[PDB]
Design an enzyme around this catalytic site. Structure first.
Site, mmCIF file in Angstrom:
data_model
loop_
_atom_site.group_PDB
_atom_site.id
_atom_site.type_symbol
_atom_site.label_atom_id
_atom_site.label_comp_id
_atom_site.label_asym_id
_atom_site.label_seq_id
_atom_site.Cartn_x
_atom_site.Cartn_y
_atom_site.Cartn_z
ATOM 1 N N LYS A 48 0.828 -1.203 0.000
ATOM 2 C CA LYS A 48 0.000 0.000 0.000
ATOM 3 C C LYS A 48 0.866 1.259 0.000
ATOM 4 O O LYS A 48 0.392 2.314 -0.407
ATOM 5 C CB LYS A 48 -1.030 -0.005 1.140
ATOM 6 C CG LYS A 48 -2.115 -1.073 1.068
ATOM 7 C CD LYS A 48 -2.871 -1.073 -0.254
ATOM 8 C CE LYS A 48 -4.267 -1.682 -0.168
ATOM 9 N NZ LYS A 48 -4.237 -3.039 0.380
ATOM 10 N N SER A 54 -3.188 -12.829 3.688
ATOM 11 C CA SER A 54 -3.484 -12.633 2.269
ATOM 12 C C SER A 54 -2.340 -13.125 1.395
ATOM 13 O O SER A 54 -2.577 -13.527 0.265
ATOM 14 C CB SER A 54 -3.854 -11.199 1.952
ATOM 15 O OG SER A 54 -2.750 -10.329 2.134
#
Lengths: 302, 8, 302, 8
Positions: free
Chosen positions: C42, C272
């Protein structure tokens, strides 16, 4: 093809970032060892101590790693042991962080926790017992004295700094834990590249054993809050001969500085990173270092 | 280190 | 001189590592986005969304960033906002991790916590209220639809993969959260470099909204435990047109896989990351993908 | 994300 055979090989090539609210007109640059496997500098010595033990035949398939470490070295060895398929036992006091115990367990470490009252002495003692019980089975890498520690710094960490600064680096500031970082870095820049930079060791004012020794005073260690540094002794991996200056920093200032790195610079560094920067900032604001490029090791992440 | 003979 | 002006510029150039206990004879390679500022992918979209808002004049000195984010985007924006000197407000449910609240506070975020019962809808609602109250003061970057998200992936993430594999990459597997990673990566490799790779989206079996949509079935989201992915909707930053295949993975398997990455590969990746690898492993063990180089995004660290 | 409208 730039693919690593395993996670051990992926160490280093960490970035230099200029500080905007420390030093004078950006004379202070930080090397972010947080950007590494296992989130610290120790990834390098973890990789290289294992690699070296392999090359010299002390570590083979079947033999187990044992090491006493309360800190990032344990994490580093855990990662490499997993990456290279060794069993590993780590010893430390029951008085550890549950997060570290759990993460170490997650990493596949056989964890052996010694009395908290007995401290790190108890953990060395126990590690020594374990190796002594089956010398053919167990190998202690001995982070404080193993030359493969500063060697990796001389081969990677230092050359990265030389390269990144086009050799314009003038001062290197690094907290001392094992001493490998300052040792190896200084050897690279001064011996291999041949520039006479000023190597600045950092240690807690609470436990200024390097300062006391160099002053010819009685060595008087103490407890402090800056994890990674202040062993309370001079490690064999600290080459006094390459140290130009020793700065002491207090726990509170190191902590305030770590927080400022986060809030003002957007850098997620640990308390020892705060210590390193606090020391660098002090020197950076002496006219004598105003036109010097100062490189600071941030050993770990928050 | 993490603790040589000090810290916390 | 390889020094970054601020921490925002230091994004990316993350490593490829070969997996030894997944795939067939090392046909599975992972891209470790954990090795980044703020410890996740991110960081890239955090940097670029801010940079873009600056270039187009929507973000200037004095204006404040506002964004609803329960996850790594908040952390990324916090770091960049600190690195570039913006105030930032983040909204999410009171039902967050105290570590994230504290770290976000540490990073200088004005934190606004909405009802936990009302969930992320409550956090979007509140963020929208805040911007609406002073539109000249507040800028919402809108991670789910802002083109600067997939653009950064097309400019950095993808080219890194192309470069690292000498263009031998055949398959890219990536979990979808905002969709920016798979979008941008696929656009780079397929459009810019012109190789017809197979782009594989990953989503929870618990919330298989991409699979349901592509099957022409009723979209039926659900809760799951794989943080970063499974929005319960198709984001505007997910380019369906570049998606070749969608694999579903369950929470338990994603978690088991994350743990295996740690214990067997010595890689510290989040749940994830486990999801992405579980999916890649499935395809890697089909004869049809036996001689394909499969690149898997590990979005974050443990 | 961290949570779009799911998770935990």
């Amino acid at each position: 093809m730039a693919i690593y055979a395993d996670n051990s090989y992926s160490i280093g090539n960490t970035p230099l970032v200029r500080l905007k609210h420390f030093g004078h007109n950006g004379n202070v640059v930080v090397k972010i060892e947080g950007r590494n496997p296992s989130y610290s500098v120790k990834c390098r010595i973890g990789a290289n101590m294992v690699w070296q033990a392999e090359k010299d035949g002390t570590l083979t398939k079947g033999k187990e790693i044992v090491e006493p470490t309360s800190g990032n070295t344990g994490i580093a060895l855990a990662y490499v042991a997993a990456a290279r398929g060794y069993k590993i036992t780590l010893t430390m006091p029951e008085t550890m962080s549950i997060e570290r115990k759990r993460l170490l367990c997650g990493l596949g470490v056989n964890l052996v926790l010694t009395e908290g009252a007995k401290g790190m002495k108890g953990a060395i003692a126990k590690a020594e017992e374990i190796v002594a019980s089956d010398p053919s089975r167990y190998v202690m890498l001995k982070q404080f004295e193993n030359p493969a520690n500063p060697q990796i710094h001389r081969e990677t960490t230092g050359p990265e700094i030389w390269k990144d600064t086009d050799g314009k680096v003038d001062v290197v500031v690094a907290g001392v834990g094992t001493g490998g970082s300052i040792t190896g870095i200084s050897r690279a820049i001064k011996l291999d590249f041949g520039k006479q930079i000023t190597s600045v060791a950092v240690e807690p004012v609470e436990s200024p054993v390097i300062s006391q020794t160099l002053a010819g005073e009685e060595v008087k260690p103490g407890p402090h809050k800056i994890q990674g540094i202040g062993a309370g002794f001079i490690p064999k991996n600290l080459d006094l001969s390459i140290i130009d200056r020793v700065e002491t920093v207090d726990s509170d200032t190191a902590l305030a500085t770590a927080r400022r790195l986060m809030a003002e610079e957007g850098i997620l560094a640990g308390i020892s990173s705060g210590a390193a920067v606090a020391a660098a900032d002090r020197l950076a604001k002496l006219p004598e270092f105003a036109d010097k490029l100062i490189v600071v090791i941030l050993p770990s992440s928050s | 280190i993490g603790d040589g003979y000090e810290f916390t």
